[PDB]
Amino acid sequence: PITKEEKQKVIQEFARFPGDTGSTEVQVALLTLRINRLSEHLKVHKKDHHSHRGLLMMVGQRRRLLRYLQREDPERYRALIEKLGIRG
Amino acid sequence: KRQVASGRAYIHASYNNTIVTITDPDGNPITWSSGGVIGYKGSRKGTPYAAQLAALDAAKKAMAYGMQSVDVIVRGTGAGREQAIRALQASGLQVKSIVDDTPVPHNGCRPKKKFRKAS
Amino acid sequence: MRRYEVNIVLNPNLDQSQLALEKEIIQRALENYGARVEKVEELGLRRLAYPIAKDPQGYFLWYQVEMPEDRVNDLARELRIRDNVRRVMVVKSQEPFLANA
Amino acid sequence: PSRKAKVKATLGEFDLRDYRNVEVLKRFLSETGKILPRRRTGLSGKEQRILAKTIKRARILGLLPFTEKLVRK
RNA sequence: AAUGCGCAGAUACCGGGAGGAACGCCGAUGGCGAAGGCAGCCACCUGGUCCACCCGUGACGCUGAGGCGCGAAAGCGUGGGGAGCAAACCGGAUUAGAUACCCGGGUAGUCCACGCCCUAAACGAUGCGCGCUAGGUCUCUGGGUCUCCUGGGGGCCGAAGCUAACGC
Ligand SMILES: [Mg+2]
Ligand SMILES: [Mg+2]
Ligand SMILES: [Mg+2]
Ligand SMILES: [Mg+2]
Ligand SMILES: [Mg+2]
Ligand SMILES: [Mg+2]
Ligand SMILES: [Mg+2]
Ligand SMILES: [Mg+2]
Ligand SMILES: [Mg+2]
Ligand SMILES: [Mg+2]
Ligand SMILES: [Mg+2]
Ligand SMILES: [Mg+2]
Ligand SMILES: [Mg+2]
Ligand SMILES: [Mg+2]
Ligand SMILES: [Mg+2]
Ligand SMILES: [Mg+2]
Ligand SMILES: [Mg+2]
Ligand SMILES: [Mg+2]
Ligand SMILES: [Mg+2]
Ligand SMILES: [Mg+2]
Ligand SMILES: [Mg+2]
Ligand SMILES: [Mg+2]
Ligand SMILES: [Mg+2]
Ligand SMILES: [Mg+2]
Ligand SMILES: [Mg+2]
C-alpha cells in the first residue's frame, strides 16, 4: 500500500509552494503514483477486473486534469510531463 | 453370551423405516432390529407401530446379554422416532439418557432434486 | 512491519525435554523472518472443544510480534512443518472492542 | 411470550475481539455449538458481526465447538 | 409398488483413511459492487465509498455516437479433476398411451487452469447528472452538545403533484 511517508514525499516534491496540497501538479503526480502501483498489481492478478475499473477511472481523471493544464498553461504542462513520464 | 449389562441404543429414524441398533459401551453392535425384521414389508415399516415393535424386538434381543441400562441416541426425523424412544422406556431396559445426534451438513453435497424443492 | 499474533497449538503429550526443543525451533523461525516478540502468553494444556489429531487436548502458545508483512505467510507456513505443531493461526493485531462494559 | 434472559445482561465487561476468552465466548452458544441469534445475545448489528468472526476463530483453535449433541427428549 | 442393492454379509454402529465439492448457526428484520454478481477462517495484494476538518487547485464540469473493457447459466477448445448432482441415455412403475410427472441407475456437464462464446424475466421490465418540492416510521453506517439532532445508504406509510388505472 501507499504509506503516509511515501505519499508525503510525493506531495512536497510537486507542490507549487509550501502547503500546496491540491494543485493540478500534485494531483497528477499522486494519480500517477496510484496508477503505477495498480498497473504493477495487474501485471499479476490479471483476472482482477474490478480493480482494473478503478485504473480506467484514475487514468481518465488524470488525462482530464492534464488536458486542463495543457490548456491553461502549456508550460507547466510540458514541464509536469517531463518530470513524470506521461503521454508517451 | 458376553453379559454386557449397559450399552447404547441407536434409533435411525426416517420416513421409510426405523432401525434400532443396540451396541456395547463403546460402539460395537450386540443386536439390531428394524421394521422389516419384524415382518412389515411394504411401507408399514415407516409406521410408528413398526418403530415400537422394532424397538421392543431390539431390547428383548439385548436382555439376552443381561442388558439392564442403555443410552439412547436418535438420528433422523421420520415417524416412529418417538415411539422407538418410548418403547425402550417400557422395555425394562433402563434408558440412562436420550440424545439427538442427527447428522446435518454445513452445506456440502448438492442434494437430490427431491430434497432440494424450494432449496 | 505490522503487529500480529502467531497462535500455535502443539501436542499435549510432550515432556519438558521436547516441550522446550520445539519452542526453540519456533522462537527461532520468528527470528528467521524478522519477528520481534513484544510479549508472550504461554498458557499450556487446555481441554479442546473437539479432538485435534485424535487428541482431546492441546498445548497453547501465543506471541505478539511485529514482522514484515510480505513474510507473514512464509513464517506461518514454515511453522506448520513440525508434526508437534497442530495449528498455526496468525491473526493481525487489533484494538479491543468493548461492549456491555 | 417467548421471554428468556439476555446474554449481554448476564455479562459485565468484555472484548468482542478476544477469540481466546472461551469462558465468556461459551456464553454465546446454544446447548448445541451454534452461534446464538441476536434476540438471545442482546448484542447489536455491529457487535454481533464481530462476535461471529471471533467465535469462528476460537473454533479453528479448538477452543469453541462447531456443534454439540442435544441432550434431553 | 417394482427395478436396485445385500449371506463374496449389505442396511444400522464404532474406529482409521482417501478424495472432491460446498461452506451450517451467525444471516436480516441486513452489507458490498457499475452491472453480471459477491457470504467458513487467515495473510497478502487491490478497487470503490461515506464522514469530520473545511486546508489546497480554481469550472478543471455533465452527458456520451463510435472505440475499448466487463458481463449469470448453458455451451465450445485444450488440459486436469470427478464426492454429490445430473441433459442425454438404461431400467422400474403410472397411464387409454406416457418418448413425462414418481422410483433405481447414469454420460456430458457441474469443479480448476488457460483460451472462447456475449445471451437472459442481464427486472426496480423504471439511462446518467444536477437543482427544486410536507412529514411519519423502521433500519445499516459516520459525526455530534448522544431526549431528540446532522450526513450517506436500505425499507415502509404518506403532503403537494403525477398517473388510463394500478400505483409513484
Ligand atoms: Mg452363509
Ligand atoms: Mg452405508
Ligand atoms: Mg466410519
Ligand atoms: Mg478419487
Ligand atoms: Mg447500488
Ligand atoms: Mg441479483
Ligand atoms: Mg479500500
Ligand atoms: Mg479553503
Ligand atoms: Mg487563489
Ligand atoms: Mg461517461
Ligand atoms: Mg466531452
Ligand atoms: Mg459469460
Ligand atoms: Mg459455465
Ligand atoms: Mg470444458
Ligand atoms: Mg474434460
Ligand atoms: Mg478421469
Ligand atoms: Mg441420482
Ligand atoms: Mg432419475
Ligand atoms: Mg473459464
Ligand atoms: Mg431489456
Ligand atoms: Mg451516534
Ligand atoms: Mg434516507
Ligand atoms: Mg437492501
Ligand atoms: Mg394526494
Ligand atoms: Mg388517482
**CATH number, position B94:** 3.30.420.80
| Identity at C34, one-letter amino acid code | G
How far is residue D27 CA from its own chain's centroid? Answer: 5
Non-local CB neighbours of A32 within 8 Å, separated by 6+ positions: A62, A84, A86
Q: How far is B5 from chain D (nearest CA, A)?
A: 22
C-alpha distances (whole Å) from C14 to each of C18, C44, C83, C86 are 6, 11, 12, 13
D66 contact residues in B (CB cutoff 8 A):
106
Q: List the one residue out of A8, A2, A7, A26 whose CA is nearest residue A16.
A: A26
Cell 488536458: give the residue: A67
> CA C12, CA C56: separation in Å to the nearest integer?
9
Contact B93, B69 (CB under 8 A): yes
Contact D64, D33 (CB under 8 A): yes
- Closest residue to C48, CB basis, from D11, D42, D62: D62
Determine whether the distance from the CB of A37 to the nearest atom of strand E is below 7 Å: yes
Nucleotides of E under 7 A from a protein CB: 1-2, 11-16, 20-27, 29-30, 33-36, 40-48, 55-61, 69-71, 83-86, 102-104, 114-115, 139-142
C-alpha distances (whole Å) from B4 to each of C25, C80, D66, D69 are 49, 44, 33, 25
* Number of Cβ atoms within 10 Å of the Cβ of A12: 13
Instruction: Give strand ranges (E) for chain D.
Output: 14-15, 70-71
Q: List the one residue out of D22, D21, D63 whose CA is nearest residue C57.
A: D63
CATH code of residue A31? 1.10.287.10
CA geometry: angle at B24 spanning B23 and B30, to 5°? 50
Nearest nucleic acid nucleotide to A21, CA to C1' distance: E56
Buried b / exposed e over C20-43, threshold 16 CB at 10 Å, is eebbeebeebbeebebeeeeeeee
- Neighbour-count burial of C14, counting CB atoms closer than 10 A to its CB (0-12 exposed, 13-18 middle, 19+ buried): middle
The three-class DSSP label of residue D15 is: strand
CA geometry: angle at C37 spanning C94 and D52, to 5°? 30
Q: What fold characterizes domain C1-101?
A: Alpha-Beta Plaits (3.30.70)
Determine whether the distance from the CB of B3 to the nearest atom of strand E is below 7 Å: no
CA A4 to C1' E9, in angstroms, rounded, equals 73
Domains of chain D as residue ranges with CATH: 1-73 (4.10.640.10)
B74 contact residues in D (CB cutoff 8 A):
73
Cβ under 8 Å to D: B residues 94-113: 97-101, 106
> CA D7, CA D26: separation in Å to the nearest integer?
11
Domain boundaries in chain C?
A: 1-101
Determine whether the distance from the CB of D18 to the nearest atom of strand E is below 7 Å: no
Cell 498458557: give the residue: C43
State in Å, rounded, how far the first CA of chain B is from the last one: 49
Q: List the one residue out of A53, C92, B83 whose CA is nearest residue D17.
A: C92
- Closest residue to C100, CB basis, from D14, D20, D65: D14
For the segment 43-62 of chain D, residues whose CB is within 7 A of strand E: 44-46, 48-49, 51-53, 56-57, 59-60
Q: Which domain holds residue B46?
A: 1-119
How far is residue C68 CA from its own chain's centroid? Answer: 17
The total number of structural domains that make up chain B: 1
Q: How far is D13 from chain C (nearest CA, A)?
A: 4
CB contact under 8 A, B74 and D69: no
Per the structure block, which three cell numbers stand in for C29? 523461525
Solved with: X-ray
What does chain D come to in residues? 73
For the segment 51-70 of chain B, residues whose CB is within 7 A of strand E: none
DSSP D27: G
Largest alpha-carbon pair distance within chain A? 42
The total number of structural domains that make up chain A: 1
Q: Which domain holds residue A72?
A: 1-88
The string of DSSP letters for C27-96 reads HHHHHHHT-----B---EEEEEEEEETTEEEEEEEEB--EE-GGGHHHHHHHHHTSSSEEEEEEEEP---
